[PDB]
Design a protein. Sequence first.
Lengths: 198, 69, 247, 158, 71, 160, 160, 160, 160, 125, 51
Amino acid sequence: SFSHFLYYLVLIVVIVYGLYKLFTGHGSDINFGKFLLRTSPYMWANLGIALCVGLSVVGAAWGIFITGSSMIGAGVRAPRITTKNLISIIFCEVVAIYGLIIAIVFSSKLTVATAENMYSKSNLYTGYSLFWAGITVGASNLICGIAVGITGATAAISDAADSALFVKILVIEIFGSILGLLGLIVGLLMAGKASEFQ
Amino acid sequence: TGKAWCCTVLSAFGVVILSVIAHLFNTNHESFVGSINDPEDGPAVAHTVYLAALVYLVFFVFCGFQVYL
Amino acid sequence: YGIAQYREINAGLPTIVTFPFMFAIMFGDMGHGFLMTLAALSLVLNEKKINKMKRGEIFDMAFTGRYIILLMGVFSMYTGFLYNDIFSKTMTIFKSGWKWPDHWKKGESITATSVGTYPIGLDWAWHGTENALLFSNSYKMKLSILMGFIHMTYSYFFSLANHLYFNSMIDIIGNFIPGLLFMQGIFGYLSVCIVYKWAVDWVKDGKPAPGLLNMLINMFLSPGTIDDELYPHQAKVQVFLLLMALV
Amino acid sequence: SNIYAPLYAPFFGFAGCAAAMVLSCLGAAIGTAKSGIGIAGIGTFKPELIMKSLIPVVMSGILAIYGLVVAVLIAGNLSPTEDYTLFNGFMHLSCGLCVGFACLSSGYAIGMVGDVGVRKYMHQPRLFVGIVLILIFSEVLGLYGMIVALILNTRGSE
Amino acid sequence: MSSFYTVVGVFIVVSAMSVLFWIMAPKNNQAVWRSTVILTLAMMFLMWAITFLCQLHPLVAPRRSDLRPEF
Amino acid sequence: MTELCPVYAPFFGAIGCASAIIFTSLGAAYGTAKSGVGICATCVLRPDLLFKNIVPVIMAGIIAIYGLVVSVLVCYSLGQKQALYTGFIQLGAGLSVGLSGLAAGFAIGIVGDAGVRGSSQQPRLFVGMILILIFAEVLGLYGLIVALLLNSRATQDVVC
Amino acid sequence: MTELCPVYAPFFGAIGCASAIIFTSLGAAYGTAKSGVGICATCVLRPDLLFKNIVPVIMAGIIAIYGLVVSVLVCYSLGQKQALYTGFIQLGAGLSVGLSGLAAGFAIGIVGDAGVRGSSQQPRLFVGMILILIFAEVLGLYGLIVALLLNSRATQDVVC
Amino acid sequence: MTELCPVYAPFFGAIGCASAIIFTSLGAAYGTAKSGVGICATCVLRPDLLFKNIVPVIMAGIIAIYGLVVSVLVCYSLGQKQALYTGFIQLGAGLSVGLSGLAAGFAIGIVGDAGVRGSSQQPRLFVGMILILIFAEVLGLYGLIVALLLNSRATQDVVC
Amino acid sequence: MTELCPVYAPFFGAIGCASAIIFTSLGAAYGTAKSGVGICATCVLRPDLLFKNIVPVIMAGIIAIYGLVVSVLVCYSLGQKQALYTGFIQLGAGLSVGLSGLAAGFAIGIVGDAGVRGSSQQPRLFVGMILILIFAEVLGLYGLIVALLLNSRATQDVVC
Amino acid sequence: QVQLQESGGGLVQPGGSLRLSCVASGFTFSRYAMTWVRQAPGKGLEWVSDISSGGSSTFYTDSVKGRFTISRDNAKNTLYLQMNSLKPDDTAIYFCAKGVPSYYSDYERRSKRYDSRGQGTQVTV
Amino acid sequence: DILSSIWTEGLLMCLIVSALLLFILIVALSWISNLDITYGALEKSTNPIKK
């Protein structure tokens, strides 16, 4: 398979390059640490914010079409489910709101730093903070949105069979929705002490 | 005929909105000439717009017959 | 959505106004509100003729909802006036509360001076202003939270109106009161703070204006500690509210 | 400047914090999703068994708490005003990897066992005590990850 | 002049005229009149009051550079 | 050169500007294609539903409008000597709406593909489709909102 | 060399110029191919519909012309000493029309193939096919609009 | 050495020269292959149409000639001391005709395979197949036009 | 600081500490998961057999104990100023128990699944399953023995 | 129209440390680079120093490379040029000039491109 | 004390951003490639056995 050949080729190239620098004594050239110090902190911050809303929306969209297609399919014989199961769509959509909210909060910190202060301790800290916090909120919302969406599909197809099953299965759905909220809480904690770009 | 109603309703607003815009230009209202990016001479553009308003009026009165008959 | 329980409070009456009005808060523009009003008004005036002729469902829904769209338009015109926006242009109906400098040259940056408060709607001085969004977003976000909370707590009180009618005293003690204290103690408190921050003249007092969003988070994650006090005894009351919510 | 506290150290601390929470959610998400399919699968055939068989979902939810606890503890140590050392950065990175992959692995097993467990529990009511016992052995896999994560965090800052 | 008491002043009269309407509302379809008008005035008032309070003591001021000097 | 204004700074603006319309175009195309087949598949037997069922194509089109709006707005802030801070703001704005609209277009396609088919067999189901489809559309709007927020800061008191 | 005009600056111009025509041609090729099979497969029984079924090919062909226009426009702006900024803008314009045109190509290909097949069974569906195709066609037009905006800004106020 | 003329500059020229024919030949080969299977399969029942059905192979062959002329033109542009700028332009010309020709050959192959089968059942369909193939053929011509314009600017005003 | 003790030395030790748990957990989970499917499938007909044939789950569970024991031992040996050599040994110890435990987990999963299913049909087979599982189990023990031997040398005769 | 106003000048002994100053109006002072040019009697305009919009980057002609420092205050629309170890060769009239947007490229500097300059002040040693 | 004379911090920032955008593009095209037309509904099929 072509794709897996590409993966192994990249892996081999990386290893050989690493050994070449290592054996010739220049092994200190790769220096990930210097790379983290010289890259501008605005890059890390903006990738964090953009992927925060981006991955969160992917989560909501991925969940919605899993539930939505099931609701429409199961609804052909039993139209009554279409309105009652809208709750399942809501639990998918809300994780986008969580991603949006974090995007508001993080945007408040994108001030312009003075040139002499550009790479100082505090500014680097904020750069790393917003990046990983944005990834954390985004990825956890992506995971949460899909998990809720899958659960919602089973709920809709159960409701079409017997109305008494719906309330029983919704308990699994609210359990799934908690994952996104915990992601939000950790996101606000990681970004809590980060100062504005001075 | 249906095609007359589309033109007459569209041209009706084409008379009002254009005429109002021309009036604000002709009075050098800040909302239309205030910025260094707006056109330089109110009355000139106002005159240009007024002609457009008259054009729509011709369409309006003509289509009035088409919906009337 | 679903048929109401017998003698239950009908969801209809509250919906008559709050449905088109909540729409108007989003769809705020006098020009678009006016155009939509004319469309609805024509359907209303001609209804005797439209009623008899047969209709496709894409058109029948519009006719069935004609009185919805009519209010949907009228309220849109009202909110468009408060946003002071017609076809993306502001309206200079009153004297502005902001005064510009006495002199400046071409291409020279200026800042306005406050001399009053605009009587109805957004002051038209904000148009084309380079920091307009930094203001209006603070305005509309706070508007949405306040209207949302008020709408929720209003309809929640229908729960009490059901319980008293059915003499379900157990629900008053069991569900209504605990739920009321829980949400009023957190998001009611936030609503109060939002309104309060507008009343205080921070620059005159020289005090630092507090960040409400940070304040909201901290009262949960670090109770009893404050960066900037919104009012005296801030910390003492907040820990009480947290304990009340937990209990 | 202290050479043991280079300014890029917080990067690895946050990376561990992110790994702790994200991977734990992935473990929890798999566990509930797979179990939910099993619970819904028997719904049309034996409605009575549902409320007394959500155990896999509840246990799958605990995995998220393991992640939360470690992520909270890491986030409590990082600060812009402290000489957060590079040694501490690596230690908190391992904190995330340990609890993260431990919870991910545990969530996968809880999902697989939970699904067939309830899905065949409808055929044989005596089966249930066995399902719970297997889930417990599947559960502790996540717990071991948290234990080491707490020990790493304890040593890193000291 | 303007102050927070300006909003309270409007609140009092809106409250007064609404409770007055509650009494004078027509008997025919009384429930629809009593609900729609009173709720409309209340909800309509909130939109004005919020938009008014937001402009009493602003923490930011208009800035621009494009305005012609004779404005 | 200047430390705040390296010569490569405009790249992030240019690629962000392009990304905004590219990713939304792919999302809108997928939504138009997948639902378009569904319209053809149903209209052969139920041609009267044609213009009623076309809504999913309409909503997919709106996602591209969001991409065009953001792309235009950032484009009007490009410049040779722009600061690096401005560049990454533009990238964030373009990537935010692009990645958001891409997902929204896919969801509109998959739901719309099912929706028009269901509309044929169960007339009550059309409104059910419309309700679900809006909450796919709005996901593109949230991307636009973040883009507008970031863009609003692109030139505020930035100094080379 | 003057750091605002590195020797490698025209590389992005050349790749931008080539990208504009390459990716749209792939889009137009797919649209012509996928719909072409549908036309042939239907017209064997219904030759009378042949010159009505041709439209999807024409629209897929137009997508290529957008890229030709942009490619020619940026082509005239290349130079030995152009600014790096001009290079990035040309790259952005090329990718914008190119990959957006590719997205439109897929949509026209799919709906065109499905449309003509359905239109053989149900003559009222042809108007529906044309209406959907226009929404797909417009996606390429958005790509052109962004590309022309970027190009108009590619050489103003540059200090090479 | 010279700043504007790095010793490695001809590399992009050689790759552009080779790329022009390589990718075009790949396109023409596929067009000949798919169409060839169609011809051999269709005319067993009906050999009198054989020489009428060759046309798609002719057009697939014509694509290759676009590759030849661009490659030949570049081949005489190359030189040991050529500037870097003309290196990029040669690469741009090579890719422009190359990948655009590859797309055209792909379309000609698929339409030829489908058309040549139908045209033996329905004799009225032949003019339709030719019409569609012209639209596919033109996609190669656009790549040539861009390539020639680029090659015109390759060295008209370059300096070392 | 000293060349024998770079500030990044703890990285290798920290990765080794995590490696011991990552891979052992995957081995234990796979062994538990596929053994559970076998147990749940058989007990429908033979519920009285459950607590006898559950043994494979115990065997899979013990693999996680190995990972925990090694992980804690290296964890108590990490330090801010440890030598680089100490880092490599800890990495080797972590990989040794980790990936060897993963191998044991896969063996227990496959053998347990087949053995439990077979044991429901033939009671004589149970002792056979236990013997084969003992051989699968011991593959984990060998990895632990190497890991403990390595760790014992991680600080012996070391100089800063 | 744009307006600029120099300050500081007069006679100074060799080795002196005079400080020049400039204030401007009619343009966004933060948006443009700023330049000092001096003319010795009978000579053409000589490029002295220039400073970017942010005040983060500067250029000094070799005649003053260690003797002058240039600084900016965007809040007061004003420009400064501190001097020390002043010597007779510095005897010239000094002009405050509005430069190119943001910052000077090498080409713009060597072209001595500036938009406008004030009525300079005389310095003698 | 530079990072590299070739792989400068400026070049690496451009590349990893490009890598992210290219990855998103590939995933997008990987979904588009799987659009299959529902031929069965579009083409009439008949038999004499059914009513």
